[PDB]
Amino acid sequence: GSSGSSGTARKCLLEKVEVITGEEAESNVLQMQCKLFVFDKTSQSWVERGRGLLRLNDMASTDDGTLQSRLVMRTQGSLRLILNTKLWAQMQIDKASEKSIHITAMDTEDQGVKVFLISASSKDTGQLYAALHHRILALRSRVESGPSSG
């Protein structure tokens, strides 16, 4: 084989990812057209943030190396991204209605945690929801060991 050293006298391997393409090769659980709304204390109500397509993409964890998840929402116009946050075990999500849902996420610019809403058909709404929950149940199952059998 070959042998050569330079500057940094420490490396992981030749086939480094830094050079390798994002190769995101992420997974698409479920995709459906939905709308996003945020509560602006200013108006004290739901304000139009961005309406378009919504889907749950599965990503790999870094410190956990496990199947991580996040909340993405692309608009209908230029599929622009306005909502991007990584779900967490202590994630807040409750089913307000069979069509609307209350989930907490962080913005991309404001990077602040706010109460987001999800409006969709009585069916679609249940789909996306049935997903989120799990996304968290998988995390809470790691932090805690669980019930120890006597």
UniProtKB/Swiss-Prot annotation:
Subcellular location(s) per record: Cytoplasm; Nucleus
Tissue expression from the record: Widely expressed with high levels in testis and heart.
RanBD1 domain: residues covered: 8-144
Function: Acts as a cofactor for XPO1/CRM1-mediated nuclear export, perhaps as export complex scaffolding protein. Bound to XPO1/CRM1, stabilizes the XPO1/CRM1-cargo interaction. In the absence of Ran-bound GTP prevents binding of XPO1/CRM1 to the nuclear pore complex. Binds to CHC1/RCC1 and increases the guanine nucleotide exchange activity of CHC1/RCC1. Recruits XPO1/CRM1 to CHC1/RCC1 in a Ran-dependent manner. Negative regulator of TGF-beta signaling through interaction with the R-SMAD proteins, SMAD2 and SMAD3, and mediating their nuclear export.
Subunit structure: Interacts with CHC1 in a Ran-stimulated manner. Interacts with XPO1. Interacts (via its C-terminal R domain) with SMAD2 (dephosphorylated form via its MH1 and MH2 domains); the interaction results in the nuclear export of SMAD2 and termination of the TGF-beta signaling. Interacts (via its C-terminal R domain) with SMAD3 (dephosphorylated form via its MH1 domain); the interaction results in the nuclear export of SMAD3 and termination of the TGF-beta signaling.
Name under which the protein is recorded: Ran-binding protein 3
Organism annotation: Homo sapiens
Gene name for this UniProt entry: RANBP3
